[PDB]
RNA sequence: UAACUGAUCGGAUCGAGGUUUACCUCGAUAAAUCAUCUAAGUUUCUGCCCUAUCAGCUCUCGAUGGUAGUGUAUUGGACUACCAUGGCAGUCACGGGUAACGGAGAAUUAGGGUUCGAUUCCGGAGAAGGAGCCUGAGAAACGGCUACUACAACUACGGUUCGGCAG
RNA sequence: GCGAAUGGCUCAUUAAAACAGUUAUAGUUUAUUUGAUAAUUAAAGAUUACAUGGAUAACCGAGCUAAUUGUUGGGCUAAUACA
């Protein structure tokens with residue numbers, strides 16, 4: 001192909017953005033950042049269609065360009081129409097001191113969870129890779145594309161850390177092993193939260209995992225899609241749509257219109 | 260003098276020890292490149308105490324194996340350390356609701372270690388492109404007997 | 417052959433028209449930037465380079 | 466646009482193979498770069514010449530066209546000094562490369578023993594000049610000179626082939642570097658297995 | 673540890689807001705390596721419409737494999753040299769036709785089918801035909817360049833064109 | 840300094856080729872982004888670091904052709920250009 005793509009089509013932009021089909025023809029294309037294209041929510045989407053603080057396109061252009069700084073992502077200022085806010089992030093709306101979790105539904109739509117000045121401090125990080133680099137030093141990396149220097153050594157590659165944004169400090173981690181709580185970042189099963197049952201590795205190039213939860217449903221997904229929302233039953237963050245558990249179309253009806 | 264020259268103009272290893280070994284005049288000097296592709300595969304006894312210098316081997320080289328792993332019958336023994344395996348599968352036919360027979364031929368590389376024979380089942384791994392056709396290396400060989408035509412032979416192995 | 421004669425030192429831009437053939441005959445078969453002896457212009461150019 | 470697309474070939478079953486794509490730029494194929502030697506400036510003044518080529522990513526790749534000095538390492542001792550290469554002999558790939566003293570990654574050549582001679586002298590007290598004067602030590606044997614002994618006694622049984630080499634001034638070694646790729650020319654000094662062998666190619670080659 | 677090159681990098685740059693000093697605070701931007709994002713090469717396996725009034729095909733230069741090198745961003749006969757003679761086929765090779773770019777899909781449908789998909793998504797190919805290239809992180813680009821074939825525009829016929837509407 | 844290699848149009852070519860569903864990259868390149876990382880400036884040289892050096896657009900002025908975002912030619916000063 002000519003070179004590298006550079007736009008994005010209304011029609012082609014992820015169902016996670018709950019986008020306007022009739023809308024236009026395009027859609028703000030996520031900027032190369034911390035999260036992958038599909039797994040992200042560009043700010044313009046976050047304020048216009050989400051919060052609804054903005055509206056028309058120029059509305060954003062003001063907000064992120066205005067010399068006041070109205071948007072914060074993980075304790076930092078952002079002024080990019082399409083910064084890819086990803087899973088388990090913390091976004092603050094300066095002018096109102098609003099704090100949000102970037103989390104998927106139970107139906108897989110990006111949801112905004114309101115946090116208390118309390119959780120707004122800690123953010124959950126999942127461990128990408130772990131190896132030693134320059135001059136005998138250990139480095140850990142998080143999905144959030146965080147690069148960590150001198151990390152606690154009791155941390156295996158597929159771990160989950162709790163991060164104190166305020167001090168850029170770590171605390172209480174927890175690997176994925178039979179008996180923990182987890183969130184699935186993507187898949188025919190995303191947005192779910194349950195107890196890890198067991199992890200059968202097949203090495204041939206793809207390991208799998210099982211899970212249980214509230215109504216004790218059986219879940220199946222690939223490791224790469226498991227995010228440890230916590231150690232031993234206690235979750236670490238407040239979940240959207242009540243608990244991370246979806247209902248039969250049948251259970252939804254009976255709960256709402258009670259059929 | 261044989262395994263070394265034999266026509267070709269030299270045959271070392273990936274781990275260029277040799278001549279320098281004369282420095283460790285007491286322990287074991289006769290080192291050869293040792294490896295283990297793992298993936299639930301035993302490393303051939305013959306592979307270790309061999310004099311063979313095959314760079315295209317999966318135990319004597321920096322040749323990896325990844326993803327696709329095959330099992331198929333062998334067709335030809337000719338060619339230098341390369342063999343053709345034939346796989347026999349059925350194809351379904353939407354309309355008639357039935358199947359037909361079909362065979363894909365595969366270029367496989369054979370490290371000297373295991374000994375070939377025509378008409379035996381073989382196990383190939385997915386190794387990087389080694390040539391126009393080659394893209395599979397032998398990792399486990401099972402000897403088998405077919406009384407005659409290898410072509411006639413068709414087994415949903 | 418018309419001449420666009422510039423004088424570094426001061427910044428003098430002058431233009432001379434030299435119709436007669438005989439004078440210009442010295443510029444023929446000379447390379448770029450060569451040293452011209454502008455005495456083949458006995459006129460106003462008495463002893464110039 | 467000397468390309469290298471595998472399209473202009475014939476699939477397994479030798480039937481010609483189709484094309485709809487004009488030669489695309491990423492199939493680049495740069496002009497070969499034979500590499501000669503200045504161990505004979507009879508004409509060639511400028512000793513060594515290396516031209517840098519702008520490669521993909523944006524990097525540069527230095528290309529060796531003409532040379533005269535490379536770097537070599539003595540396997541056994543773990544020594545490595547930059548020396549002047551002499552004449553190329555036996556290129557294996559083809560004998561023409563030897564006829565044009567071209568430098569292939571694996572071209573077997575000769576070098577000046579000087580740096581190695583100089584060193585083997587300082588660390589063992591053995592010059593390697595014609596055999597008789599063999600050693601050259603100190604006058605008094607009480608202090609640190611006691612080590613040149615300890616090492617020298619390490620039965621420095623440097624193959625009968627390594628020995629002859631030094632004295633002759635010439636040294637055998639093969640190269641390990643793509644001149645057309647990095648611009649340099651580095652090689653290891655020949656020994657045991659290959660030495661004995663490559664030499665044979667040379668003995669029988671001429672005889 | 674040994675040495676090689678030194679054309680790798682290690683800031684001679686730029687704001688604003690503060691404030692009785694010694695300065696202080698928040699930024700711009702340049703640029704190296706590792707990650708990261710983005711995208712791209714190349715790749716495994718499986719699947720295509722008619723047709724033998726197409727049965728043997730590929731192999732003088734590569735056709736199949738081995739060796740060493742080139743070359744590339746890297747793998748590879750991708751190209752060179754030397755060596756072996758293979759590689760494919762009636763479970764249709766090789767060759768030919770297609771008013772054939774492939775999908776997602778479209779029309780009618782008891783079930784099974786029949787016929788289409790130039791055409792909003794995706795991937796591919798191309799910009800008059802064809803080859804070559806500059807530049808760049810990135811194209812053989814083509815609303816950039818060079819030559820040829822056929823052409824388009826101006827001319828004081830010397831020469832010129834930012835001349836290619838499949839936007 | 841970036842961009843101009845996105846898009847936009849078209850289907851002529853093109854039947855394991857392209858494509859699709861799959862897989863590999865331990866066989867690779869990726870400007871822009873996000874996270875992190877740098878105590879030692881190489882030798883010879885040379886040396887100011889409270890910080891170096893030289894030149895050129897724009898401009899001034901002369902000019903060519905019937906001709907075009909053609910360009911000669913002289914004089915003037917700045918960079919994250921160049922050195």
Ligand SMILES: [Mg+2]
Nearest residue numbers: 029031081082
């Ligand atoms: Mg943008």
Ligand SMILES: [Mg+2]
Nearest residue numbers: 204205206325
């Ligand atoms: Mg893997």
Ligand SMILES: [Mg+2]
Nearest residue numbers: 411412413414
């Ligand atoms: Mg039967």
Ligand SMILES: [Mg+2]
Nearest residue numbers: 522523524809
């Ligand atoms: Mg770079």
Ligand SMILES: [Mg+2]
Nearest residue numbers: 687688689690
């Ligand atoms: Mg100030």
Ligand SMILES: [Mg+2]
Nearest residue numbers: 314740741748
């Ligand atoms: Mg090779």
Ligand SMILES: [Mg+2]
Nearest residue numbers: 767768769854
């Ligand atoms: Mg055909």
Ligand SMILES: [Mg+2]
Nearest residue numbers: 721772788789
């Ligand atoms: Mg069709």
Ligand SMILES: [Mg+2]
Nearest residue numbers: 793794795796
């Ligand atoms: Mg299209």
Ligand SMILES: [Mg+2]
Nearest residue numbers: 001795796858
């Ligand atoms: Mg593709």
Ligand SMILES: [Mg+2]
Nearest residue numbers: 837838839848
């Ligand atoms: Mg039109």
Ligand SMILES: [Mg+2]
Nearest residue numbers: 717718855856
């Ligand atoms: Mg295929």
Ligand SMILES: [Mg+2]
Nearest residue numbers: 895912913914
């Ligand atoms: Mg001037």
